[PDB]
Amino acid sequence: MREIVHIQAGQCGNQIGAKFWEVISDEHGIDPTGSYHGDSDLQLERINVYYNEAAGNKYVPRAILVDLEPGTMDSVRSGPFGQIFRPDNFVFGQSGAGNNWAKGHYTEGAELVDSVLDVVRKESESCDCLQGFQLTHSLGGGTGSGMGTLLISKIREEYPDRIMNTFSVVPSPKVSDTVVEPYNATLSVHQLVENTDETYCIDNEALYDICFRTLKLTTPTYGDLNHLVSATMSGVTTCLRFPGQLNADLRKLAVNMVPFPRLHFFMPGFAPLTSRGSQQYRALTVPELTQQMFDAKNMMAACDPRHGRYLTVAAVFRGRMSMKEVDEQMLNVQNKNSSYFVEWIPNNVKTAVCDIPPRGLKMSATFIGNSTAIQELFKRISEQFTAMFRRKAFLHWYTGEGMDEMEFTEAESNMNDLVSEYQQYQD
Amino acid sequence: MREIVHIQAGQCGNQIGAKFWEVISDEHGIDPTGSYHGDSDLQLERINVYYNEAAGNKYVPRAILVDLEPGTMDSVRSGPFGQIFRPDNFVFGQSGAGNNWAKGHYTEGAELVDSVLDVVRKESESCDCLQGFQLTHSLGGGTGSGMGTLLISKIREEYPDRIMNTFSVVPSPKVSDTVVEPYNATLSVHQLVENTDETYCIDNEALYDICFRTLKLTTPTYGDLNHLVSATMSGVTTCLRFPGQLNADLRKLAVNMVPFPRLHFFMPGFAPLTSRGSQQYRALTVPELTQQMFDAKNMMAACDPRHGRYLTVAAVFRGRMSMKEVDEQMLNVQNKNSSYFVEWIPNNVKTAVCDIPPRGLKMSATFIGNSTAIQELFKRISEQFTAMFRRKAFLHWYTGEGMDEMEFTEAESNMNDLVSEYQQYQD
Amino acid sequence: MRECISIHVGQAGVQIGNACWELYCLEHGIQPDGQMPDSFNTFFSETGAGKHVPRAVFVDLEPTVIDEVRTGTYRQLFHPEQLITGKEDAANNYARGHYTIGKEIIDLVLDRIRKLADQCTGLQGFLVFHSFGGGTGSGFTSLLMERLSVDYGKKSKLEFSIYPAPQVSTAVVEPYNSILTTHTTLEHSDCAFMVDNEAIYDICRRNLDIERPTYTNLNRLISQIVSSITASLRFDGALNVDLTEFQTNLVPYPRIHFPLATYAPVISAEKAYHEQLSVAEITNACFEPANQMVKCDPRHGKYMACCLLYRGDVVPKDVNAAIATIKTKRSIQFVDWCPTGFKVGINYQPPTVVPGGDLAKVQRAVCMLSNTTAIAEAWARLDHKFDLMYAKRAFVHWYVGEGMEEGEFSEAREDMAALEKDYEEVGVDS
Amino acid sequence: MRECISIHVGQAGVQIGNACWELYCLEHGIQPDGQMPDSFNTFFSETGAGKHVPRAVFVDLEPTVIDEVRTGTYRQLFHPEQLITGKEDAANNYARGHYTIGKEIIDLVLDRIRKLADQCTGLQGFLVFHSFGGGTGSGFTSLLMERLSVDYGKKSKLEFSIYPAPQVSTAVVEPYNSILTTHTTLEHSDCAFMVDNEAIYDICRRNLDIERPTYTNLNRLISQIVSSITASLRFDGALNVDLTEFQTNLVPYPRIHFPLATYAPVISAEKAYHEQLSVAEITNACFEPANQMVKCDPRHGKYMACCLLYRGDVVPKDVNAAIATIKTKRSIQFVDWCPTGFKVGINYQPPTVVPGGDLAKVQRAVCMLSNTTAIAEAWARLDHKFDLMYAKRAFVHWYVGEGMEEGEFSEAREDMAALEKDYEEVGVDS
């Protein structure tokens, strides 16, 4: 009954993935050994969405861990919750991809990918009715980006009628940790445009801003950043995992949020978010959550929503709440902020409510916005790509892996077209 | 009531044989002295299939141990379980055969064989209704191959209406331990084609692959390899030894699996097979067993079943299981993998179920597949034979034992014909 | 005899149905396990000894909502085979409901319905509960209604529908679903009671003094209306209205079968003590726009027929007086082709109230079902909404993917335009 | 008097027989040791004091299945000489069953049967249980049937057969065995009830809510059917059916002796509480394809005769009503040469249920035995299967080895073709 298959590719993908798994096990009352020690029958009712049931009262993540480097795998296995994963679901190379999309997509990744495919087929067979796939990775490196994209293509070919979801961490110029990021992102974005049904644009810069400005966190770590992403991930599939008053799964969300096939790039947000000191001076109420969610400072993509228009927003609420209140607050936001919503889609907001709140909170919210302002993210990337490509800088490496210049030209064109399309509907 | 007579010829045959005996005694609750110390009445009910009852509450294997070298015999007698065997059932030469099929078949073996024949006649007389014979050996050496074949011929002449089964370990080029293997195999294969009713093609290479890849065993030994073979052997005759819901003995299996007289070369498989670490992350269920069994990586012959078609598969299940489930899983496999099954034999799968599972497991499965892909094994061997025979390399030794070139020509022709026949039905 | 079969489709339908069945149980003294420590037979089959089973089928394309019922308080009330669930929902897509996903479950549900109907000896007809906006509530229900119409023919079908609001809309694609279901609703339904969540919310806040009304509050209220409709079959009083009777009175032309329901009095325990809730008063309150179940202005429309269904301590004479008073009120106008537009029912049983409910216990209540031209306004706004989105073909591709054709949309819109025009026509005086 | 002799052949026959004998014991209050702390005499001989012995012979060519019986719970019920076992089985080979292996044991079994029959003073006939697919169930049974036909002549022989499934087939050579046994079954059997494991499995999953039904589940169900058939002899009620009577009613032409059996109601303890399992309902359920014991479509066939055997709290009038209702159902068509196609039996004893069984205890049950043309479809698929394999002469050599001739196969196929044609003919209207 509606199983999701999880895939983690490259370092970032793996680490965020681990965080996601940790949170989800806690949520469903699963301990580091795979045993259920929860309180409520609701925690086990839909356990099969994310876990396969093994012999002797144990649960194992329907998760595939992929990397061209074994170090990441080792790190995962040695982590808290590392032992819950199926040993046969770790699919690793020995070499690494050296921040080269071509190595990940055409060379080393190509050699690797068949094992992964074999694993995932088995994982699909195991599930009674697989609704689809969730891939966590980055677009700026070689494995997550090149290998990941390749894997996606393969998956879609074999499962063309299933939902294909990605949580893609994009490279920003402020927090620019690598040189060839523009290339890797450009190449991967293109592929994503044709083969994913929904893509959550996660930005490290935005995460840092959230941590520093909102969470008041003097020294955020990648772990802390990852936590935010994990929360967001949990939010989307809450309706699949628990009961509720109004329920929307992955498909329902896509259908309401994607009016044209290409426009499936979301700016996610999560509410509430408070400092430890500033927690006592707040109201645990729906109007507050709503206020938080639509704010630009709470979006996980480095784009100003006020620089574009919202095509659609999907809001997913967790906790015991008044439907009327939710409906009033959502109507208020669209009436007051009329100018930030496209006028040819009346009721730009879709609402879903799950009765089970996350741990530690009485209420929570997850926001998925499809904004034309996401073009900003792509534009910057394009610019950076141009800056390098105009001089054919670092191209030789990619060509050594069998790539031609023409592919670069194509990808760039494609991305530009996508950008244009978004602009068109923005008006 | 349906006694089986066991014969072990040459080193390999002896060692595998020993393993087989060890497992079977454990299964039937027999200790190293021959005394029954089991729990269940079912363990003794059909004890007479493999054991003769001696004076004073003791059981002795209906086993004949044959070798041209006494070292092997010594090794057996000194082993754990060595003392259970009848001293008069060890029939040994002093010289050895020096990896020469001719010495085993025409010379030393000829001199030896009459003693063996005398023993086996007595063993037949002892049993109330002997259903037939099981011979364990290799085709690549001199004793097991030449002497073994000779023995088979002799047996069949005297017992033409009895079932003649062999567990034959074939030489592979990857794990090529000897030079004249191609010759010995070719000569023996020919003989086997005319005189055995069913032949289990066991391959060392495949065993190693199983051990390394599936069992995750860093340093497999021959003992470990032998264990697998022993398990398979036990599987086939489970229906003769225990009660069940649907029962198939050696004859029933042959009749369902062999549509034409010559096509009696099986690729065996055994399920389940797991690492010690990966044991906790699995489901003890029939769908899983089924999944394991039909996989190419779990076949004990170095042939890809996807390179041919299945003429027939016989599946033997041990443990308390739902018949419906078994029937559904077997139908599913044939419907989904339609292209790997010959279309002119509807319901290519035969099922048998024994209620008594092996020790340590709640359920187990043994697979016997008659695949046209077995031609690959023969083809390689043929090629190797040709490579040597074209230059008459090492022939002089064989001719010194009375052999003529013409025999070689005949054997090669015969094997080629067999290969052609398999190809024909593959289509 | 006189049985009514209830069909509850999709989330909304299921949840309303739960409330309804809670209410029926309380009304007939049936415990949540089916035991009762007669008229109840209109809603319940009776088996063996100390067991009563609802004459109902619950359907959803997803398991979640029905799964609650299975686990929950009334798990023993329904037999498992009457609670029908698929694996994947219609994802707010009419096409998925009517075709792709619905075609897998429809036969099964029909078979069960037939089995249920065979057990009833005086079938009055069907009560169908569903939303207009959801893919299952629209697409599946539409399909189901067609099949029922085919199989059963001249049996009366009454559908209670959660029609989407002007402002308070929860999904984006609602107007598409609403338009598509309406087309089929026209030909296969005999009477359709539209209801609007926004209106219910307003009522709960204004009349019941509830700060934060949730769906549970709405559903309870909705169930009451259904009870009023079926009380004439489940009890007996001075003046009685059967379903056929109701149809005859309330429906002047075949297509014009969209009455608005309104219930009175809806009051709090404390607020009611002070009020002197007379027959005249409640009747007067019925014809006021603020107590309506659909957002729209009757003052801007004309009445064609009203059924007034009274229950509890009521006598004919005072009902007559109330009607007379209503006649003399200039702001309530009736069309000239209806010299008397009042069908009146009076039943002896006072409305029973659900423990922990929002409504206070009253000696008398009334449910008015009135066919007014004013409801056409709702259709106009919905049509307008549809027209914008369709101008850009927004979301259309999804529907096409699941086998729907673009021409169907246009057809549906045309049908609704024609219906609005028909409604306009009946309005005008000669 | 009125004895029936049961013969259980091969594994399947033995295992069904075990279930049957468990059921009979429970029905007559006979303990597993033969002691009973009258009508039971139809199934049991009585010896000396406090001992009853089944009028049965159990035969297999291998010892394993019978050995279980000897060791097991009912070891004292049967005397050792009634449990007959060879050493080697027929290995799914008809030839081995009928000739090579069977010729060694047949005389012995016949002698024992004769001894058994001499003890009975009013022999009604034989109940023969066996599979169509196994070498013993086919080859041995065929042989045995011939001999019985010769020795006894005009005694009625009724065979209950596990006919192979379309999809769910356990052996490769099944079609050969099935075809070969059918040829002999035609001439030497008076009535043959075919049964299909796949259908039983479906029933167990759908109607009994069993995730994983095993052979023990099937066998129990099968035994119930036999009990219904023989209840008219083992008890007495308002309307009675003897075996000869049954034959007269159900068999319109000598070759057309293949009725399909169906049993109602098959329900779980919890699922049954809610259902109001009336006579009309159960009767209706009988004529539905989903509850059939053979996989095939009656909607695509025509009924020639149906026997309805009711048991428990049933009266004639309501049976008549049910029959009338069935008559008016267009989807159930009867041939024009049968103006009334209903033989009806009613027995007072409710079905007794085996402790730890899958079926719930009911006040009334029914076994319908109906001769429909639809069963011919099974034969068609089996024939098709046979034809493929024979095209290549696959496995044929084995049969030849054991003394069978190729011409026999062809003969058998021809016979079945002729039978199918006959079945077609009777179908058509004039």
Ligand SMILES: Nc1nc2c(ncn2[C@@H]2O[C@H](COP(=O)(O)CP(=O)(O)OP(=O)(O)O)[C@@H](O)[C@H]2O)c(=O)[nH]1
């Ligand atoms: N939000 C997070 N960002 C991360 C994390 N780890 C790395 N990154 C960011 O991602 C980029 C580096 O990506 P990766 O290590 O994932 C490249 P990958 O291992 O997939 O391929 P290779 O090129 O083979 O190393 C960069 O922007 C890092 O700053 C993390 O745990 N969280």
Ligand SMILES: Nc1nc2c(ncn2[C@@H]2O[C@H](COP(=O)(O)CP(=O)(O)OP(=O)(O)O)[C@@H](O)[C@H]2O)c(=O)[nH]1
């Ligand atoms: N799977 C196993 N393979 C074995 C074992 N012992 C030997 N062999 C393999 O068999 C081949 C050697 O065969 P043998 O020692 O049996 C030759 P044999 O003693 O029968 O005759 P001689 O020619 O007189 O030595 C070779 O491929 C070995 O690698 C064993 O215990 N298990």
Ligand SMILES: Nc1nc2c(ncn2[C@@H]2O[C@H](COP(=O)(O)OP(=O)(O)OP(=O)(O)O)[C@@H](O)[C@H]2O)c(=O)[nH]1
């Ligand atoms: N009055 C009321 N309205 C409801 C309730 N539940 C959902 N709705 C409304 O129904 C519409 C959504 O349709 P649903 O019934 O949830 O959808 P569905 O029929 O299950 O269709 P899918 O989920 O798309 O398969 C919205 O207008 C909701 O406001 C309820 O309990 N009461």
Ligand SMILES: Nc1nc2c(ncn2[C@@H]2O[C@H](COP(=O)(O)OP(=O)(O)OP(=O)(O)O)[C@@H](O)[C@H]2O)c(=O)[nH]1
């Ligand atoms: N319904 C049912 N079918 C059975 C049972 N046991 C075996 N079968 C079916 O019977 C057929 C196999 O025939 P068996 O009765 O086992 O074979 P046999 O008559 O013993 O013949 P041989 O063993 O070949 O001598 C298959 O179709 C099985 O599915 C049982 O207990 N119940």
Ligand SMILES: [Mg+2]
């Ligand atoms: Mg890396």
Ligand SMILES: [Mg+2]
């Ligand atoms: Mg040696």
Ligand SMILES: [Mg+2]
């Ligand atoms: Mg829904």
Ligand SMILES: [Mg+2]
């Ligand atoms: Mg048998």
